[PDB]
Design an enzyme around this catalytic site. Sequence first.
Site, short mmCIF file in Angstrom:
data_model
loop_
_atom_site.label_atom_id
_atom_site.label_comp_id
_atom_site.label_asym_id
_atom_site.label_seq_id
_atom_site.Cartn_x
_atom_site.Cartn_y
_atom_site.Cartn_z
N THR A 31 46.21 63.38 8.83
CA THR A 31 46.98 62.12 8.94
C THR A 31 48.02 61.91 7.82
O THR A 31 49.08 61.24 8.02
CB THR A 31 46.03 60.90 9.00
OG1 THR A 31 45.06 61.04 7.96
CG2 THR A 31 45.30 60.85 10.38
N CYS A 53 39.28 53.18 6.50
CA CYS A 53 39.52 54.53 5.86
C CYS A 53 38.98 54.55 4.43
O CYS A 53 39.52 53.85 3.59
CB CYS A 53 41.05 54.80 5.77
SG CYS A 53 41.29 56.54 5.17
N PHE A 113 44.79 51.83 8.61
CA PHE A 113 43.58 52.46 8.06
C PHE A 113 42.31 51.90 8.67
O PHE A 113 41.23 52.02 8.07
CB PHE A 113 43.57 52.27 6.51
CG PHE A 113 44.69 53.05 5.81
CD1 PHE A 113 44.57 54.50 5.67
CD2 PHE A 113 45.88 52.40 5.42
CE1 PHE A 113 45.63 55.24 5.09
CE2 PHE A 113 46.92 53.14 4.78
CZ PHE A 113 46.79 54.54 4.64
#
Length: 442
Positions: A255, A387, A380
């Site tokens: 990512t 995340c 996120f």
Amino acid sequence: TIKEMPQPKTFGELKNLPLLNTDKPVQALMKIADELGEIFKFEAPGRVTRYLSSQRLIKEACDESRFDKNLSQALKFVRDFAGDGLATSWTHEKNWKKAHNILLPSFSQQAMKGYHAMMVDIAVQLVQKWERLNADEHIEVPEDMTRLTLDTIGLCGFNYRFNSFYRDQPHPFITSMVRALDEKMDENKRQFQEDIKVMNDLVDKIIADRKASGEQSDDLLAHMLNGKDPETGEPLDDENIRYQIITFLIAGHETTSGLLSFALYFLVKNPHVLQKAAEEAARVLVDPVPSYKQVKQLKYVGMVLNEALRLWPTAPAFSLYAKEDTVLGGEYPLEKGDELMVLIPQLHRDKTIWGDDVEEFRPERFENPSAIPQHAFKPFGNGQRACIGQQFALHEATLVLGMMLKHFDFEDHTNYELDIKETLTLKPEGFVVKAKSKKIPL
Ligand code: HEM
Ligand SMILES: C=Cc1ccccc1
Ligand SMILES: [Cl-]
């Protein structure tokens, strides 16, 4: 008063399933959303889920007392390799909370300062590669960003060198990772099992070299290997440590490569933005190597990165299930176990939040981030399942983009036409530029 959800076109008994038979299913789901609005039902044989696009509904879906993380079909497949690692565990599995608590301190401010010098080691290899190209040669942007991000997680997280920049060919890790994973979309079983062995020997080497080392370490691997969860009082077992190594080597780079590649794409397409970010980089990065504190002052470079995540968030969807029967938005009753998908690129184009110019690349939207309503910007993910590597991604990307803008002028020499390839992540496939050195020593 209760509303019926829109649904896109159906195919007899196959329901909506054929809409996903495309190499770009997120992009096709975004178009359905432009046609149907903030929520639609998506049915397949034996399955249903509801796709959400508006801040007003996603803010409820982000209510952790009502909805928890669901494993999407994709995470369910990745689970074959990443097990009950952080990304592919249910919140209720013992090893999710144990590993969350053990690994959180690996992304503290103090841990981030510890990783900085090794991020610089990688970023300098990237700058040197481009400095060393001959006249008229060009750069394959997502290829080189993946070289950077992979080497960065291996070295910062595990003290392992993939040495991506010594290779024009893929690292045997990565391509083995890909064809084992595809080999469940006679003979391709010595082949799939050659690959699994590639993955297993790498994890084996990471672990074993650390043990044979007499050097003290406080990196991510050190935490996996030695840290104890304050709750249970227990450390991770050997089986779960293996899954976490595989989890972080993949989640820790793909990512971030996407984000870098989109950010540079947006800079070359918007030359006034590019000039403003290059001015910041020249003003702030006054030394041969950036420091931790200098990267923290790259305010406008960080706004560029957030505005690139707004338009093309590189993990573009996450799944949820209802913990109990509940009513979404005062209009849609849901039953316990019902699934929702958050379509992040569409959330990020909600005109009620961002105004009409949503397709425009304008990093100044992020000037005053307290102005953004709750749950409007979610690249996120959400809540305790958000995340864990957010600050790591954004430090690395701000460092690297600042250095790129300090050292080179960039040319969109092909007038590149955005083509977004979909994997577990998104990237601008085929994006290429020319970088003319500003001749500033390192
Ligand atoms: C810009 C780059 C990145 C983006 C956009 C991103 C995005 C996300 C998103 C949306 C989730 C939630 C997934 C879900 O709900 O199913 C997530 C989770 C996660 N990410 Fe990232 N990520 C990035 C970088 C990283 C990095 C660098 C690391 C590791 C260093 C990482 C490790 C993880 C892990 C372990 C989880 C699972 C956390 C948990 O559930 O406890 N990510 N990420
Ligand atoms: C790179 C973090 C991440 C983790 C799970 C799914 C997509 C992205
Ligand atoms: Cl604004």
